[PDB]
Amino acid sequence: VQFKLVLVGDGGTGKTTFVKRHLTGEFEKKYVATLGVEVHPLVFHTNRGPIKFNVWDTAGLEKFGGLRDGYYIQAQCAIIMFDVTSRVTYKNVPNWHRDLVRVCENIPIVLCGNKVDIKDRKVKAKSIVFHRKKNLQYYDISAKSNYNFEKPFLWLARKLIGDPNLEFVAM
């Protein structure tokens, strides 16, 4: 039960920081731009057994895109990420969604607003609506404070299998 999960979004959105926390539990404070893509297996233990996400953490910066949409090929789900401290990143979402689905017809896609821990929220929850019409799931997350940390994965896991009652149990 392995699943390919591409992680896209603007630069500095916290994609790599997010993935890092799930694997090591450490919080990286620095922003070292991702170069093309880097594949990270993530394992979760669920009521029904272990689930493994091969997270293709892709680059959000234009200069380091790499194979771009080429990475999406054969993806089975995805997380579109933006930073609620930066209005620009949300506005680019439709571009990230476009690229992804033109490659991936029907896959579960979660939309995540990262950094909700920063008191100076610029992308108000009221403005976050793009996911409605694309039939996508949305979650506020913080990699720093671990707020709604697993929500994207639990949802994706529930959709990829066929079990709404499925739950992460942790060992």
Partner 1 sequence: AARQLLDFSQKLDINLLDNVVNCLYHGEGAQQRMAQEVLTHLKEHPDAWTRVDTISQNMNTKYYGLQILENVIKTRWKILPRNQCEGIKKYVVGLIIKTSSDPTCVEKEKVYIGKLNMILVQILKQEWPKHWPTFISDIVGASRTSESLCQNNMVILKLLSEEVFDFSSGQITQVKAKHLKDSMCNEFSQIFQLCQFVMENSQNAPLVHATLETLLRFLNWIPLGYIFETKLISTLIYKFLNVPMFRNVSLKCLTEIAGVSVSQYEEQFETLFTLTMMQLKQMLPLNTNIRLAYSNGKDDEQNFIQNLSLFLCTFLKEHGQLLEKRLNLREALMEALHYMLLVSEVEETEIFKICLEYWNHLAAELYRESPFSTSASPLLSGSQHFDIPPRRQLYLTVLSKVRLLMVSRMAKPEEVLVVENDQGEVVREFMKDTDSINLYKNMRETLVYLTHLDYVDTEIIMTKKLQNQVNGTEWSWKNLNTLCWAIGSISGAMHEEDEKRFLVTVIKDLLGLCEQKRGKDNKAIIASNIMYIVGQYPRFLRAHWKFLKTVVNKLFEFMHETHDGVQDMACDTFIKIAQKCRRHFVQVQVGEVMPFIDEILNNINTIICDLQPQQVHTFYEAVGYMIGAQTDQTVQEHLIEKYMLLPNQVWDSIIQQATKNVDILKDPETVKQLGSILKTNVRACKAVGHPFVIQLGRIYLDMLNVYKCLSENISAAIQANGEMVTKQPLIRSMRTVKRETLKLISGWVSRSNDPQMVAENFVPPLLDAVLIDYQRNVPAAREPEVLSTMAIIVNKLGGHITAEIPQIFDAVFECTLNMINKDFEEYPEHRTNFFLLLQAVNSHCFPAFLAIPPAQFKLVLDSIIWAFKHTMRNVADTGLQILFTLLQNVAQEEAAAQSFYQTYFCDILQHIFSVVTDTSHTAGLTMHASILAYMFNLVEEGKISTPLNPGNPVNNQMFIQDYVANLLKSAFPHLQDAQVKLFVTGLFSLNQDIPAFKEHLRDFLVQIKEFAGEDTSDLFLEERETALRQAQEEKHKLQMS
Ligand X SMILES: Nc1nc2c(ncn2[C@@H]2O[C@H](COP(=O)(O)OP(=O)(O)OP(=O)(O)O)[C@@H](O)[C@H]2O)c(=O)[nH]1
Asked if residue 115 belongs to a known ligand binding site, the reply is yes
The token duo for 3 is: 């699943």
Residue 58 marked in a binding site: no
Q: Determine which residue in the list 20, 48, 140, 161 makes contact with partner 1, applying CB under 8 A.
A: 140
Contact 15, 34 (CB under 8 A): yes
143 binds, among ligand X, Mg ion, partner 1, none (CB under 5 to 8 A by kind): ligand X
Q: Is 10 in the site for Mg ion (CB under 5 A)?
A: no
Binding residue for Mg ion (CB under 5 A) from 14, 22, 57, 92? Answer: 57
Interatomic CA distance for residues 82 and 91, integer angstroms: 9
DSSP state string for 35-84: -SEEEEEEEEEETTEEEEEEEEEE--SGGG-TTGGGGTTT--EEEEEEET
Q: Which residues bind ligand X (CB under 6 A)?
A: 9, 11-17, 28-34, 59-61, 114-115, 117-118, 142-144
Binding residue positions for GTP:
10-17, 28-34, 60, 114-117, 142-144
